[PDB]
Write a protein that binds this ligand. Structure first.
Ligand SMILES: [Mg+2]
Ligand SMILES: [Mn+2]
Ligand SMILES: [Mn+2]
Lengths: 138, 138
């Protein structure tokens, strides 16, 4: 039911509190380089759906549901960056390829990439074999 | 330089040409599920910049440029489809996942995914190991 950009907002709020203990509307406007009225409108939609609350001095506060979604997206980003690093995507492309995947892949597929990432680490000689395949191509 | 929309046309045109020598406007409309008048507008755009030619009583044939692009696009769709099958995504999620991400991955990542698919092809017992990780992880 939440749009991808609603989820990205919860992820950003969780990481703002990780960085300094608070999430402000002004923080999000400055980072996205948008007008603060679009942020307060997004905050309003997230508030009405019970993902966050707002109190003027503490700022933006995640609910149990909002904090669960925000953490999940941080870890999705990690998992997919691990995947793309493992298979050899270069540093110029990996970031936009992670943002590309994470917005257009079902959660079933994300889970399967998580199994794959686990597969290459339970016996790391699998990863050396994969890199041999790349070198003999190269 | 070609837009996502052009890439979806060029890929379908290549498949039909691959099967039949020419791509008819009516088969393109059917496959992409758009109104024939949309195809015409795209056909006129792609004709004007030399991706294709319209031949009377035949349909569309790609130029060297359009065919090079269209062949690469079909390779991308087919490689991603194999990739998702291989890591076990539900057969109900596959076409829509592929149509999703295919416009959002660099060619660098497509090549590395190709290295990954080749890694599993060169010793298919690696697919059985991968399946054990997934059954265990559950
Ligand atoms: Mg992100
Ligand atoms: Mn496609
Ligand atoms: Mn597509």
């Amino acid at each position: 039911m939440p749009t991808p950009s609603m989820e990205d907002y919860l992820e950003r709020i969780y990481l703002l509190i990780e960085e300094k203990g608070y999430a402000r509307v002004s923080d999000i406007a400055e980072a996205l380089e948008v007008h603060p009225s679009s942020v307060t409108k997004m905050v309003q939609k997230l508030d009405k759906s019970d993902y966050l609350v707002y109190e003027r001095y503490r700022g933006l506060i995640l609910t149990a549901k909002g904090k669960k979604i925000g953490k999940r997206l941080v870890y999705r980003h990690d998992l997919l960056e691990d995947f793309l690093k493992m298979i050899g995507v270069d540093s110029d492309h990996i970031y936009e390829d992670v943002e590309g995947i994470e917005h257009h892949l079902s959660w079933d597929a994300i889970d399967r990439i998580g199994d794959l990432v686990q597969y290459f680490q339970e016996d790391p000689s699998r990863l050396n074999d994969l890199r041999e395949v790349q070198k003999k191509n190269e």
